[PDB]
Design a protein around this ligand. Sequence first.
Ligand SMILES: OC[C@H]1O[C@H](O)[C@H](O)[C@@H](O)[C@H]1O
Ligand SMILES: OC[C@H]1O[C@H](O)[C@H](O)[C@@H](O)[C@H]1O
Lengths: 729, 729, 183, 183
Amino acid sequence: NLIKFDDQNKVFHLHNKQISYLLSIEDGGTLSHLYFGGAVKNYNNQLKYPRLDRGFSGNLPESLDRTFSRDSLPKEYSSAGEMDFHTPATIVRNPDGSNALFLAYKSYKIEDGKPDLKGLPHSWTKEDDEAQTLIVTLEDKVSKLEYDLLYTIYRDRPVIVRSVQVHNHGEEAVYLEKVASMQMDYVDKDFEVITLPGAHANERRVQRENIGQGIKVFSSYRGTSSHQMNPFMALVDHDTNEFMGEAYGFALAYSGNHKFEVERDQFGQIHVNTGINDYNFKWKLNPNEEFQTPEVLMVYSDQGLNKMSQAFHSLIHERIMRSKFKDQIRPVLVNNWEATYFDFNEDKLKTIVDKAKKLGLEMFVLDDGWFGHRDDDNSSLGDWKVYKKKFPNGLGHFADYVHEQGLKFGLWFEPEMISYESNLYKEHPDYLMHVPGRKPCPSRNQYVLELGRKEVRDNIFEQMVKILDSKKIDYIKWDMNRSLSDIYESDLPADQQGEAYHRYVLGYYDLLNKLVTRYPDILFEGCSGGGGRFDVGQAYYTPQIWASDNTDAIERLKIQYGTSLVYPQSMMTSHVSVSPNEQNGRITPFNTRGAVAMWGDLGYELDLTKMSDEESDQVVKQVTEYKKIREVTQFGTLYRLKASASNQCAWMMVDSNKNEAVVTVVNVMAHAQPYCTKTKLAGLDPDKRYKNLETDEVFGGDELMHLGFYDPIERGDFKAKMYHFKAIN
Amino acid sequence: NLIKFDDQNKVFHLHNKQISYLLSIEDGGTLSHLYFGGAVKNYNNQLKYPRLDRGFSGNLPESLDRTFSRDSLPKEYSSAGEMDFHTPATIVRNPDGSNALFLAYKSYKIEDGKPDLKGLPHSWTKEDDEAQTLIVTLEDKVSKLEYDLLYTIYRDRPVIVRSVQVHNHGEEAVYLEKVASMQMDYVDKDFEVITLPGAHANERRVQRENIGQGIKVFSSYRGTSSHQMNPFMALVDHDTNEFMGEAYGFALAYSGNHKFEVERDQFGQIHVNTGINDYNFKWKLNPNEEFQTPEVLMVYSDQGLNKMSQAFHSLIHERIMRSKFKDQIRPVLVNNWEATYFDFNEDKLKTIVDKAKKLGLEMFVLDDGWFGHRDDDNSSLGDWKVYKKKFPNGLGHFADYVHEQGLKFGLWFEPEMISYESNLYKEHPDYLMHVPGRKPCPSRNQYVLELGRKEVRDNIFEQMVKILDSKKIDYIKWDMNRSLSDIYESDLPADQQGEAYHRYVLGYYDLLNKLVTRYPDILFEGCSGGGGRFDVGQAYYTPQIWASDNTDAIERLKIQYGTSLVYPQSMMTSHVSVSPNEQNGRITPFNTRGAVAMWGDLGYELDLTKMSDEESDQVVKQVTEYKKIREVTQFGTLYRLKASASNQCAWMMVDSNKNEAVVTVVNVMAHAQPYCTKTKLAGLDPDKRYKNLETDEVFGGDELMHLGFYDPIERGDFKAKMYHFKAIN
Amino acid sequence: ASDNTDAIERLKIQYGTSLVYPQSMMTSHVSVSPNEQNGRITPFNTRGAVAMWGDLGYELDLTKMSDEESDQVVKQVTEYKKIREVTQFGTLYRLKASASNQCAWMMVDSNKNEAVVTVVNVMAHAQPYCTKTKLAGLDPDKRYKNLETDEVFGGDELMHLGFYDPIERGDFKAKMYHFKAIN
Amino acid sequence: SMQMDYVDKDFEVITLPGAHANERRVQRENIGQGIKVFSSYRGTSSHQMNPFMALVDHDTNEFMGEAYGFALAYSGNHKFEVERDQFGQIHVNTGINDYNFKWKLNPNEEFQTPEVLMVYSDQGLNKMSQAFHSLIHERIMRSKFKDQIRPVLVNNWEATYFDFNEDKLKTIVDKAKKLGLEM
Ligand SMILES: OC[C@H]1O[C@H](O)[C@H](O)[C@@H](O)[C@H]1O
Ligand SMILES: OC[C@H]1O[C@H](O)[C@H](O)[C@@H](O)[C@H]1O
C-alpha cells in the first residue's frame, strides 16, 4: 500500500502520488536517511552513501572498516556515546554516570492509521485507509532501552509525521536528558532556512537566512512555544518563493519548550533535529515505563511556499483540530479589552452590547476584569468567581441580557495563573510555582500554578465548571500572560525536577482537554498575551487563537503573513481597533483596519458607544460585506501574493471548486511619484470566466492569473482595496 | 591607572590609549555591560539602558517595577533561574534538584598584573605595571555560591582578557552544568560573524555570515579544540575588511570542548557567550572548593582585520607562549612521514640524513613508526621504546649519526593514546578510556588513555623521560590522532562522570606542562592529525604546531590564511611535499610549494634521496633564500593582502622598524585572456625609500602602498612570485 | 530642492542632494499636512526639523493657522535663528540613511565648537529595538554641553559612545540636539 | 569633458536618479561588462538623473573607504558612461550628451566643454561630499549672498496656488510679520 519494506536490500519506502521517503538499515544496524522529496515508484540502491576514510570520523565497535562511520553517514536519529559528533537527537544518563547510548536496529512494524499519542495533541485519521504508520525499533543491548521511531504517511497529502517513544526494559532507571522527535540529514543540499521570530506585539515575522557550518538553534525556554520564536522552520532552495521551488517545512505539535537545530557539518551535509528543548529536561524513565515525544509535521512542496503552507493548513484544519466549530463560520464578535481595559461595570458593558446589536454583531466577549476584585492586573488570578461590585446581580444576569439582545456571550479566563493577592493563594499558597526557599520572580505581577499536580488542576477545573455548566457562556478566551521562570514541582523528588517543564505542559493539556471535551458546545479561542502559544499542539484544542496584542493594521500585515506560513487563516483572529493605534500610535484608515482584520476571523475591539453615526454606519457596512464573503475568506485556499517589504501586502482566498475568490491588496507607504503596479491572481481555473462583483466585468481565469490588473493609484498612506470574483455559468 | 571604579554612579572603566570597557551595577545588583570599543577619557551616564515595560520580560523578586528586567538588560553574565530567557552563561544544579541561581553584585578588587590560572594555560605579565585586573564578585545568598569575574587590561594593547572562578561557600555540594568564561551583550549593532570551520586536511577556512534572530553555535564535542571549528570568532561591521572597519575578536585559551554562542534576541541585541562546552559537563563543586574557567582573549580593532590579527599575534607570541624558542629562528627541518610512511629502517633514514646535510637542512625529524612494533597504524601506541628491527643498535646510535652529520634531531610521540596490541594494554588494560561494560569505538584503530588519572600520566611521563634525559632529542612532535568518544573516568564516582572531558584536558595540560618545563632546551611542535588542536591554550606549551596534514600548496593558501586570522605565522609550520600532492592529487610547481611553505616555518617532507640533481639544487636555492629572509617572514608583522577566492592569495611581513619587507603573491587559476592585476603593499613607512633587492630599483613607501606594481602575467596554473624590499640609507 | 514638501520623502531627496551639494544650496519649506503631493500626515515638529536641513521657509496659508499652531511657528523660527549659522554653513555629516528606518545628520562649525544634530524615525513599531546615535566631526578633547539638558560630554564620548534615541509612539517623529563646547 | 580608465578596480557606482517630486535618491550598483549610461536629453540637467556619479569600493560607506566623485558643471544634457571592458578595466567618460549634438567648428574657431569636478576621498562618502561642498561654496558660487545667512521666508504657492489677490496676500504678509518671518 503506502509503505513497503524490502528485506533483501533493507530499505523502507513510504510513498504516495506526491512524495517518497526512503530510509535504510546500514552497517551496525545504523538507521540511515536516504531521501525525502517528490515520489518515485521504485528504489535501486543508488543512494548507498559513499564509503570514505574520513579523518577523525571513527568506526563501529570492534570494526576494522575505517570507511564507515556514524559521524559521517546521514541518519534518521543519533545519540551521545556512538562516535557521532553532530548535535545528537538523544542523550541518556545511566546509573554508572555515563552518557552512553548505542542504538542498533531491532525490528519494524507497519500499521494502518496512526496511533494516538498518550497525553499529547496529535494528528489523527477518520478512517484507517487514510494513512499508514511505520514504526522502527532501535535497541541498546547493554542498557536495554528501546526507541520506537514512528513515521506516518497520509494517502493524499505531501506529509510525513514523525515522533519517538522510548521504553526502558532494564532493571534500573535511566534519565533522558534529550529526546528529539525526529532527525533528518541531507546530502548535497544548499538550503536557506526560514523561521518566524518575534516578540510580544511583534510575532512571526518571516526571516530567511543562509546556513553556514556550525549549528543554528531556534528555540524556547519560556515553558510555552513563545512569541519570540515559533516552533516551525522551513528549508528552501535559494530560488524558492511563494510560487515555485522546493520547500521542506517542519512544525512541532507542542506548546512548551522547543528546539530546532540546523547543523551544516564538516562534509557539507545538513543535519536537522526537532523536539522538546533539552534545557532543564531530565526525565526519569523507570523500568517498564515509556516516554512519548510530541510529533513533528513534515511537508514537502515541489512548487513554492504557498503550496507548502496549504498542505499544513489542510492537515491542521482537517486532521488535527477536533472542535465541532472547526468547520463552522466564526462569529463577528466585539471584545471590550481595548475599549475599556479594566474600567467598566455592567451598565457600561450593557451599552456596548446594545450598540453591537444595532451594528449587526453576533457575540459580545467579556474580557479581563470581571472576577475576584480584578480592578487592574495586580490581583485576583485564581479567584474565578464574579466581581459583585461590577456585576451586582451576578454574571448570569449579564449573560442573560446579552442573549436577550440576540448575541452570543463569551468570557475570558486565565486558568494557569495565580496572584499573591487572591483567595486562592491565601487558601493554597503551595499551589504557586516556585523553588522552595527562594522568592520567585514576578511577571505582570503574577505567578504560575503547579499544573503538574492533579489537585491544583482539579481546583481550577471545579471553579470553571461552576460557571460553565449553566451553558450561558458560548465562547471562552483562554489567556496566559507570563513565561515560566522558577522551575520546580513541589511533589516530585529532587531527581525528577528536570520533569517540571514538561509535566507543566502535560498538565495544561490534561486540564484543557478535559474542558474542551466536557464543553464541545463552546467555541474556545486560545490566547497568550496575543500569539505567545500559537502552535499545532494548541490547534488540537482551540480552533482559533488571538494572533497578537498588536492590533495595528500595518504591523498586522507582517504578523498575519508570517502566521499564515504554517497556520490556516481560520485559526487566527483579527480585530478592528481604534486609531491612533494603542500599541504603536499609527494612524490608519478605518477601511484598512477592516480589510486587514478580514484575513483572520473578524471582530471589533473598541468602544462602539463612542463612535459617531458616520463611523457606526461604516461598521454596519463592513459587517454586512464580511457576512457575504466570510465562508471564502475563513475557509478558502489561501495564496499570499505580495509581501509588505515590497511596500504592498496582498493575499487571496479561493473556494474549493475555484468558483469564488476574495482578494485584498494593501499599499503601505504613499509616494508622490508612484510606480504603476499590477496584481496577478492565483489558484483559479484558467478555463472559467470570473465576474468582478463590483464592476460586473468578466475575465477568464487565465487573464486574471497571467495579465492581472492595475492597482488603483491614490494619495495617502496605508490604503487597501478588496475584490470579489465569482465564476459565471 | 588603567582601571577605575566610580562608587557614586557604580561604573567600572577599564581604559588605555586604545580601548575603553565600561560596565555598571544596575538594579538588583545586576552587572550590566555598557561598552567596549575605542577609548574615551570619561563616562557620564549616557548609556543607562532605557527603561521599558517589555511584554513577557519579567522582573526582580518582590519588585513592582515592570520596566527593569534581567531578560532585556545587556549584561556581563547570566544564569538559569533569574528570569532571563537568553542562553545563559552559567547553569547550576542544587541539592533540591532545581537549576536556580540568582547572582547579585557583592564586591570588587583591582590588582596589578593578572593572576595565574591554576592548572590552565593563560596570558601573563613580565612586570606588574604591564596590566591591571578587575575582579568583580557576584553572590547567590541562598546557595552561598560566589562567581568572580576577572577582567584584565594591558597598558599598551587593545585587549581585554576575561575568565570566571566559582566558589562554593555553602554546606552542600552543587553541580556546575555550564560555566562560560565570559558574556557580552551589544545594543544596536548589526554585525556579521566570522569563524574558522573545517575538517581534517581542510582546517580553518574563513567563513562569514549574517546574524539572524536565534542562536548560532560554534563548538566542539571531540575532547579537543578540533579541526571542524576553531575556538575563535570575530564580530564585524558589514563593511569591515582586512584594512578598515571595526572588529571584535574572541579566542578561547582552551584545548578541549568549546562553545561560542551568538544570539540575536527579540529586541535586536546581540548576546555572546564563550567557554567550555556544556555537553556532558557537570562539575561537582564541594563546599570550600573552586572552579576556574579558561580565559578568553578579546581584541578590538578600529581599522580592519589585519590590525585585529596583529594584536592577537603579539599577545600570543609575547605574553602567552613560554618556550625559550619563541624568539629564536626556527630550523629548516626534513620530516620523513610523507617520504616513507612506515616503510623505513635506520639505513634508509641515514640516506635521507646524508642528503639533507648536502642540501643545507638543519634538522631531521623521525616521525611515526620508530617504537614498539609499529609497522603500521594498528599497534604499539603506549610502547615508547625503540623498535629494534628498525634500529638494531638502538635509537641513540641513530641520533648520534644525525648529530655527527651536523643536524639537529627530532622525534615524534603520541603520548595520550593506546593500542589494544601494545604491551601497555597487556600490563594495564584499565588505562584505556571506555565505559565499563561497553566495547569502545575505535578511530585509526586506537583508543585514548585515562589521562585524568595521575598513575596513567606518571607511566607515560616515565617512559618519555627515559628517552629524553639523554638530550639526544632536540625537538619533539607531539601528535594526537583521534577524538574522544567513550567518555568516562574509571576512578570517579558516578556523580562525577560529567567531569571526564575537562579532567582529560587538565591531565593533558599537567603532563605536557611537566615535560615542557623539565625540557626547556627542547623545541616542542604540537600536532593533532595536523591542526586539530590549534589554539591559544596550546601555544602556552608549544610555540609551533603542524597546521594541516594537507600539504598541497594551493589548499594550504586557504588553511594558512584562516589560521593567521588569530595565530602568528611562527606558530604554524609548513612543509614542501611531493607533487602530485598525496592528499588531493594536485600538480603544482616546486617554486609554489616553496613560496607557500615559507609563510609558516619552512620544512621539507618528501624523500630527498629520490630527487634528481636538478630538483636537489632547487632545494639548495630555496633553503639559501629562506635563511636570508626568515627572521622577517617568521617574526615580522603580518599583513594579508589578497584572499584566494579572488583567484590570488597574497601576504607580506614587515620588520618591527619598517626597514625590511618580504611579500608573496600566488595566482591560482590561469586564464588565456587575463586581466592585469596590481599588488599594493601595507605596513611600510611612507617616508622611507625601499630597494627591491632583485631589481635594485628604489621606491618610496608611499608609492609601494598607494601605487603598488603590476603582477607578472604568465601561463600555467598555481604560479608564485616573492619580493624582498629593504630601506636604504 | 523639490516640489515634494513631505517631510518624510524629503529625507530621501535631501540626503541624496547632499551627496554633492552643500546644504545652503538647497531650500526646504514647512508645508501643510496632509501633504499636498502624497497625502502623508506628519507632525508639525517633523516638518520643521526636516526643513531646517535646507534653508528654512514656510509655504502654507499662515492665516488659516490656529493660535496654537501659530505659536509653534514662532517657536520654530526663534530656534532656527539661534542655530542657522551652524545648520546653513557648518560641515555636514550624514549619520543614518532612511532605509534603516531612521535618517540622521548634523552640522559642525569650522572650529568644532558647536554642533546641531537631527534624528528622524520613520515607521513606529509596537516593540521597538533600542537605537543609539553617535556623532561625528567633533574634537575628541573638547567638552560639549547639551544646551537643552545642561549636561557635558567629551567629544570622544559623543563620537564613540553616542547616546540612546528617545522611544516614543507614532510615526514620523523627530528630535534635534544642540551642543556647544565649554571653556 | 574628460575620460579616465582604471586598471584592477572592482568598483560599485553611485548615482542620483529620480523623477519630478522624487529627485536624487541614492542608488548604488555593481558594474558588469558593458556600458552603463546616466544621462539627460531634456535640455536640462533633469529630475530623472543628476549630473553626478561616484565610483566606490564595495566596502565604502559614509565614514570609511575610497570614493571617486564626478560632478559636471553643466545645466543641459549630460552623459556619464561607465564601461567595464573585456580586460576588466573600468573606462569612464563624462560630458555633454552626444544626442542631437553636432557642432560645426569652422577654421580658426574653438569649442570649450563644460568642466568636471573630480574628488578623491580616502575616508568615506561624507569626506567626499564635504570636498564638493567646500569647492562649490567657496570657489564656484559668486553670489554676494553665498556667505550670508538666508532669510526665513514664506512663499504663497501651496498656500493659495493661483487663487489670490493683493488683499489676500496682504493678510499673509501681516501674519508673517507677527510670526517673525523675514521675507
Ligand atoms: O489582561 C487582558 C489581556 O491580556 C492579554 O494581553 C491579551 O492578549 C489581551 O487580549 C487581553 O485579554
Ligand atoms: O602517523 C603519523 C602522522 O600522524 C598524523 O596524521 C600527523 O598529523 C602526521 O604529520 C603524521 O605524523
